């Protein structure tokens, strides 16, 4: 069982930190693009985590689109082989793209609108507000609204969690309500009541990553539920990869 | 007595909020300005804000040059009255660096390098409540290191006069200033930025360097910034223009 996550955003926006927080694990990244492959034990999940720093508005997202196209191409070439073995092929197709929006507190940059528009039919895009401890509660409500307004206005097809299966439709419907996720990451941890907890400690107080009243990290983490990973994978295989495949089959003649 | 402040940085980085915090006044502002008559210490200020993003720093250089040009044209007039002329030359530029936590952006080096002989540049770390105290030390160190290795002439408060050397040496030690701006007040009367996990007190030297930045407004420091604007930066402009004009 594979799960492939791509994080996109400007340098120092907190992408690597969020991945480590999400999996509670320091990752040794390897070669503006880097990736790690990591096995979860007792979960039977093989992860490929990929990080891409963005900065020529259309050129900005090109390296990301190319990476994505390449994982599709590798899978297509395997499907087409006479002597194929689809089990034992490592499927690296990107199941989810976390798009990191900087916390200016204003709105979506024009560059981010173009990027998410170019990605929408290539990958399941989930926009997140990076370093959301930067923003006060009232500023955040307004910021989230304006971002959503622009996504809707520009007809950008971001991912939505499935709400069809009655349980847990509840969990999923509330996740959708929180998009774009206000995320906080941290390498720093303290033991609290015998439990390991990630925090950002300032002179005036500490942001608790796993506290839902501080940020949406706990809501983002529910994407890792088996049912949600499956929906993201199925949508990748049956929709985005198929779009790629159809265009390629025409080109191959 | 006039004092003219320019804030430069990317949109939404806290420029207008910081001006409001510096002067404890809500202001109603490409580039925008406001004129503030600080009847406190009898000073008229022009506060200018320019949104950036080598062509990137151009609107700023042009703005600065235009104030120099107006002053020069006045100095050259047959019927001149230099007193009661409104000097709008920029006395200090607060250059906002984004709190990424890593280093100085290449764009910022180029911008500061271009501005160094046009205006007194003071780099500030915007929204410094974004950064923990431990990373903030390293971040400041890395910025200063790039500024020095790139031979960038940022402003330094004067320390040759004992009447102010203690205050000003402490100021210099905190550059680039870790700033935080505020639009709210609590009882605790305290100006704050309030989060669920605690409140930043902008006027508290343990939370940020706002109180240190504010000492720029001491009479002696405004005077030094002005004198250097007039005797150094304006002269550099003047000499070039006199060569051009013949
Ligand atoms: N305020 C804040 N800072 C963060 C957060 N996440 C990471 N940082 C800091 O931002 C800096 C860059 O983070 P990093 O994960 O390397 O950024 P990347 O270049 O996007 O991979 C580091 O100093 C982090 O400690 C966050 O959620 N809030
Ligand atoms: N975290 C943080 N946010 C700030 C600070 N100062 C201002 N803000 C917020 O940043 C957003 C944009 O600030 P603003 O002053 O209008 O930026 P400007 O475009 O550069 O003039 C607003 O939501 C402010 O409330 C600060 O020191 N720290």
Curated annotation (Swiss-Prot), chain B:
<feature type="binding site">
    <location>
        <position position="135"/>
    </location>
    <ligand>
        <name>GDP</name>
    </ligand>
</feature>
<feature type="binding site">
    <location>
        <position position="51"/>
    </location>
    <ligand>
        <name>GDP</name>
    </ligand>
</feature>
<feature type="binding site">
    <location>
        <position position="51"/>
    </location>
    <ligand>
        <name>GTP</name>
    </ligand>
</feature>
<keyword id="KW-0963">Cytoplasm</keyword>
<feature type="binding site">
    <location>
        <position position="181"/>
    </location>
    <ligand>
        <name>GDP</name>
    </ligand>
</feature>
<protein>
    <recommendedName>
        <fullName>Septin-10</fullName>
    </recommendedName>
</protein>
<dbReference type="GO" id="GO:0046982">
    <property type="term" value="F:protein heterodimerization activity"/>
</dbReference>
<dbReference type="GO" id="GO:0031982">
    <property type="term" value="C:vesicle"/>
</dbReference>
<feature type="binding site">
    <location>
        <position position="135"/>
    </location>
    <ligand>
        <name>GTP</name>
    </ligand>
</feature>
<feature type="binding site">
    <location>
        <begin position="127"/>
        <end position="130"/>
    </location>
    <ligand>
        <name>GTP</name>
    </ligand>
</feature>
<feature type="binding site">
    <location>
        <position position="193"/>
    </location>
    <ligand>
        <name>GTP</name>
    </ligand>
</feature>
<keyword id="KW-0175">Coiled coil</keyword>
<feature type="binding site">
    <location>
        <position position="181"/>
    </location>
    <ligand>
        <name>GTP</name>
    </ligand>
</feature>
<dbReference type="GO" id="GO:0042802">
    <property type="term" value="F:identical protein binding"/>
</dbReference>
<feature type="binding site">
    <location>
        <position position="16"/>
    </location>
    <ligand>
        <name>Mg(2+)</name>
    </ligand>
</feature>
<keyword id="KW-0547">Nucleotide-binding</keyword>
<feature type="binding site">
    <location>
        <begin position="12"/>
        <end position="17"/>
    </location>
    <ligand>
        <name>GDP</name>
    </ligand>
</feature>
<keyword id="KW-0206">Cytoskeleton</keyword>
<dbReference type="GO" id="GO:0051260">
    <property type="term" value="P:protein homooligomerization"/>
</dbReference>
<feature type="region of interest" description="G1 motif">
    <location>
        <begin position="9"/>
        <end position="16"/>
    </location>
</feature>
<feature type="binding site">
    <location>
        <begin position="193"/>
        <end position="195"/>
    </location>
    <ligand>
        <name>GDP</name>
    </ligand>
</feature>
<feature type="binding site">
    <location>
        <begin position="193"/>
        <end position="195"/>
    </location>
    <ligand>
        <name>GTP</name>
    </ligand>
</feature>
<feature type="binding site">
    <location>
        <position position="193"/>
    </location>
    <ligand>
        <name>GDP</name>
    </ligand>
</feature>
<dbReference type="GO" id="GO:0019003">
    <property type="term" value="F:GDP binding"/>
</dbReference>
<feature type="domain" description="Septin-type G">
    <location>
        <begin position="1"/>
        <end position="244"/>
    </location>
</feature>
<comment type="function">
    <text>Filament-forming GTP-binding protein. Lacks GTPase activity, which is likely due to absence of an essential threonine residue important for hydrolytic activity in septins. May be involved in membrane remodeling, potentially by its nucleotide-dependent cellular membrane association/dissociation ability. Able to bind to phosphatidylinositol-4,5-bisphosphate (PIP2)-containing giant unilamellar vesicles (GUVs), which serve as a model of biological membranes. Self-assembles into ordered cage-like structures on the vesicle membrane.</text>
</comment>
<feature type="binding site">
    <location>
        <begin position="127"/>
        <end position="130"/>
    </location>
    <ligand>
        <name>GDP</name>
    </ligand>
</feature>
<keyword id="KW-0342">GTP-binding</keyword>
<keyword id="KW-0479">Metal-binding</keyword>
<dbReference type="GO" id="GO:0005525">
    <property type="term" value="F:GTP binding"/>
</dbReference>
<comment type="similarity">
    <text>Belongs to the TRAFAC class TrmE-Era-EngA-EngB-Septin-like GTPase superfamily. Septin GTPase family.</text>
</comment>
<comment type="subunit">
    <text>Septins polymerize into heterooligomeric protein complexes that form filaments, and can associate with cellular membranes, actin filaments and microtubules. Homodimer. Homooligomerizes. Forms (via GTP-binding domain) heterodimers with SEPT5 (via GTP-binding domain) in a nucleotide-dependent manner with GTP promoting heterodimerization most efficiently. Component of the filamentous forming heterocomplex composed of SEPT10, SEPT5 and SEPT7.2. Heterocomplex formation and the filamentous polymerization of the complexes is enhanced by forchlorfenuron (FCF), a synthetic phenylurea cytokinin.</text>
</comment>
<keyword id="KW-0325">Glycoprotein</keyword>
<dbReference type="GO" id="GO:0042803">
    <property type="term" value="F:protein homodimerization activity"/>
</dbReference>
<feature type="binding site">
    <location>
        <begin position="12"/>
        <end position="17"/>
    </location>
    <ligand>
        <name>GTP</name>
    </ligand>
</feature>
<dbReference type="GO" id="GO:0031105">
    <property type="term" value="C:septin complex"/>
</dbReference>
<feature type="region of interest" description="G3 motif">
    <location>
        <begin position="51"/>
        <end position="53"/>
    </location>
</feature>
<dbReference type="GO" id="GO:0000287">
    <property type="term" value="F:magnesium ion binding"/>
</dbReference>
<feature type="region of interest" description="G4 motif">
    <location>
        <begin position="126"/>
        <end position="129"/>
    </location>
</feature>
<feature type="binding site">
    <location>
        <position position="51"/>
    </location>
    <ligand>
        <name>Mg(2+)</name>
    </ligand>
</feature>
<keyword id="KW-0460">Magnesium</keyword>
